[PDB]
Ligand SMILES: CC[C@@H](N)c1nc(N2CCC[C@H]2C)cc2c1CN(c1cccc(-c3nnc4n3[C@@H](C)CC4)n1)C2=O
Ligand SMILES: CC[C@@H](N)c1nc(N2CCC[C@H]2C)cc2c1CN(c1cccc(-c3nnc4n3[C@@H](C)CC4)n1)C2=O
């Protein structure tokens with residue numbers, strides 16, 4: 318009650334409300350488990366993080382204040398015995414990475430529908446002055462109806478925490494050049510970084526991996542910052558339509574001043590075409606079986 | 607670094623000031639009688655001393671007439687003392703607070719001397735990052751000296767701390783990668799800061815000084831942000847107005863370098879010399 322926006326954190330065992338099912342996956346953030354509501358029988362995903370004896374509260378708040386069909390729903394969190402369990406919408410088919418690893422390259426129409434859906438979620442997030450900063454196949458989830466939901470605001474919360482603390486150390490601003498003020502306040506970039514990530518994700522869904530995937534991370538950073546760096550392209554030309562080649566070209570615009578917003582990208586031919594609906598992903602899921 | 611009590615070589619005379627960096631004292635050499643400034647920092651047991659050592663290294667390796675003279679440093683009982691030249695008049699901010707607005711010729715001389723120091727630092731990709739009237743000192747002989755490498759010495763460590771957070775970069779936008787590896791800015795930020803400082807020398811405060819710091823930061827990050835200007839138009843020459851206009855170029859990509867600014871009419875004019883500032887020091891009495 319003392320918070321402006323209540324994060325809805327229960328100081329109790331999540332097993333009071335849920336039946337813990339299988340571990341779906343894990344990483345540096347912690348683990349994701351499947352769970353079932355003890356009264357309604359509805360499925361949920363629990364993201365469990367091991368605590369040390371505030372940035373997770375920021376992640377919960379980013380999620381809670383989203384109320385959009387293309388962003389995973391929030392159902393409350395449990396803080397118990399040094400563990401935080403964030404309860405969210407369960408997406409029965411997993412991530413697009415989980416799917417394409419069995420299925421192979423998605424079709425152009427299936428990629429188009431996913432991009433339209435991700436752009437809707439992004440336009441909504443950017444309208445709220447939020448940035449995702451971790452768009453990729455593993456964070457775009459698919460439910461049993463073939464519908465698309467964005468997940469994982471972990472990096473978004475880490476950046477929010479970093480920028481809020483940074484204000485404590487910057488000192489007086491009056492003599493700062495505008496590019497120094499941009500780093501101190503915003504980290505030196507804006508929400509258009511998500512549009513680039515979606516373009517890379519479209520290549521990922523078409524080629525099963527992002528460009529340079531087998532190059533070392535620090536070397537990829539080095540390659541991307543060289544003066545003669547050029548945005549990546551789809552390897553096969555003839556397989557894709559000129560609209561998919563162009564969608565990649567404009568989302569992967571090098572200069573952020575010319576890279577279009579999520580709202581603007583929703584007018585692109587590739588994502589505004591009439592045959593885009595969840596039925597395309599239902600076809601993909603049939604192939605999965 | 608000397609492993610001895612600086613009180614053995616100096617008599618502490620008067621605390622000149624203090625801040626987040628610690629304190630600056632006026633001190634006198636026990637044998638020569640020459641005056642020095644001692645910047646002291648108390649080191650806590652768990653502190654990382656890397657950025658303090660880098661600050662000493664910058665001062666020691668700078669061999670330039672427009673950067674404060676360095677004498678040595680002392681480390682004794684976890685107090686670090688950086689010994690530098692003592693400036694009798696203090697900073698340009700300490701001066702204009704008593705003297706008032708500097709003349710266009712005095713500002714032109716100061717900008718020339720600051721650009722010479724910045725050209726030396728920028729030639730080795732060293733960024734001062736805290737150019738302002740309080741960090742430009744005037745020594746007893748009338749020479750203009752840049753001081754305070756406290757921010758500059760922390761840039762590399764801050765970039766390294768921030769790099770740890772970077773996850774996988776395969777889906778990362780090139781501008782995000784550039785900020786992670788190159789910082790989001792370069793030495794041209796000092797050219798902007800000198801432009802603001804010239805306005806401060808002329809008007810007694812930087813533009814928007816009465817506006818809340820957070821609001822100033824937000825205004826600076828808007829796409830329609832307009833660089834500031836001198837308040838009076840007729841009081842200043844066309845060369846001074848153009849100096850302000852070009853140093854305050856919003857795009858760092860088009861902002862002139864320190865060497866390019868040294869060819870500007872304002873600072874390449876014939877009558878600029880330390881006599882213009884020794885006159886300023888005479889007025890101080
Ligand atoms: C990592 C587990 C993932 N492979 C996975 N599999 C699933 N299925 C269902 C059938 C078998 C399997 C393929 C099903 C799911 C997931 C993830 N998830 C989910 C749901 C809401 C939020 C988050 C979330 N919030 N932060 C993070 N996430 C994750 C994206 C990682 C970081 N995740 C699901 O509903
Ligand atoms: C440490 C140096 C500090 N003076 C300093 N300087 C800065 N600048 C910018 C220009 C150069 C310099 C003047 C800028 C910063 C800092 C600290 N900070 C920050 C920001 C978020 C978290 C933490 C943080 N979380 N855990 C820890 N930290 C650190 C405090 C160490 C333990 N820190 C900044 O953004």
Ligand SMILES: CC[C@@H](N)c1nc(N2CCC[C@H]2C)cc2c1CN(c1cccc(-c3nnc4n3[C@@H](C)CC4)n1)C2=O
Pocket residue numbers: 622623624627630643645674690691692693694695696697700740741743753754755
């Ligand atoms: C400390 C107060 C300052 N107003 C001040 N006053 C003075 N006087 C003379 C009599 C009355 C008063 C006007 C005299 C002086 C100063 C500073 N200083 C000096 C000298 C070398 C380095 C640094 C230095 N290195 N890092 C930093 N500094 C400082 C700029 C703070 C950050 N400073 C002087 O010689």
Ligand SMILES: [Cl-]
Pocket residue numbers: 483500501
């Ligand atoms: Cl910063």
